[PDB]
Subunit: 253 residues, 2 copies
Amino acid sequence: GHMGTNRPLVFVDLDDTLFQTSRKMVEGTPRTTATLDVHGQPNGYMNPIQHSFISWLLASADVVPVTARDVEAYSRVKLPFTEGAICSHGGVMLHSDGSLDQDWHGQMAKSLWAFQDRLPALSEATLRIGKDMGYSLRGWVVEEEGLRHYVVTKQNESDDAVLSKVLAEVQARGMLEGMHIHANGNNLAFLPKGLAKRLAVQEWLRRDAKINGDRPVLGFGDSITDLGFMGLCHMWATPARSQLAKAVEEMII
Amino acid sequence: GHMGTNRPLVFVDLDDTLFQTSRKMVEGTPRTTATLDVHGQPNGYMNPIQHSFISWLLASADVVPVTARDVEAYSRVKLPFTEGAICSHGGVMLHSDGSLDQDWHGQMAKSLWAFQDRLPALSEATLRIGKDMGYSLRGWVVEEEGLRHYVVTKQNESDDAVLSKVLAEVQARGMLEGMHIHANGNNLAFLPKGLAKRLAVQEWLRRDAKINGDRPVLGFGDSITDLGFMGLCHMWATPARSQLAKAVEEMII
Ligand SMILES: [Mg+2]
Ligand SMILES: [Mg+2]
């Protein structure tokens, strides 16, 4: 029979699904502010269709962000999400009021303690292996309170093909066993096995089913690696020009 | 500025996206009737998630079916669509009250007159070429009012790989120039160039923009060939276990 709410539960990626930076839009086109930079100034935008879409979705369903952003960067997202969030590539769950989920934090600490020294070492080596190769990079360890989660690397060349080079080398040098990778645009991330959007979405659904039983689940994402959590949904969706959609277009023809 | 409605326009495939036959569901599982056969008895069903999903979508957005079903077969779909429909693989547009769109019918007649004899000939040959390789098939020409639209072929072996064989031969014998194909499950269709869900959806959007300007457009489909019309949308979506989703899963790994 029916229990709890029967409205859809919608897991949404953030960057390049709901909004994007100025450099990824055509100059001069209408837009509204979706994110702020660390200096408090706008740095991510929605075009009019994007704003209409997320407003409709927020009003029509229970919308849960599923994002690589850490808690601080998620707090600079200026959208009125009301149901909590999954942050830091699945390393963090936030309650609706923004407080940290202590249970998941405990489970994550368990999965990631074997990695706590390797992650700073791997970021150091990558940034050095990058200068060695000759690129002007940057990178850091994403961490949430002491617990270190994953490694991210970006380039300042305006050439995202730089990151594919490095990824090819670190793979050869075998610095990535027991881990998985995310590469989209100017972002290359190295993630421990037990850190994934999929695992957090899996847990979110387990908790939801105790309250609301089986209700429609929809997943929205733009990256190929978003297919991990999207495959847990009844239906999944992608923007027409996303990394994922472009890959699908090449597969059919 | 704003004009008309700003609710999403959602183009939805029907068979295997919103519902399916009994043979495609697990025996005994809960279900509700979505379609009737020609004898008036139920023959397509929604599981509880599917029913919750389409009810939500119909209440939340302007939903337009985009279907291979001809007008008679669409009339056996027992869902309360209120905005009209695209039928017969894009060959037919219906107004909200179910009456035929005369303009599109005129444009289709124009595109398909060079095919009016070839389609019965191609169906005849395919059904004969099928008995020769010895499969027990069946097929016919889909037509609405005299104007012939496309050729469909099915098999009674319970072996959908039979149709891939025939398709390989008719392609070799070159009976399909100037045409395109749809193959999913126990269905193989040969379509003239100017007959496509994409063309009708393209026209539907052109008309909508004169009334409602630019509003979010979402496309839902399960077949690889549904990517034609889905690529005209701002976002597209698919059931997690569709032909399309299965192809995407093989492309990534
Ligand atoms: Mg993203
Ligand atoms: Mg279908």
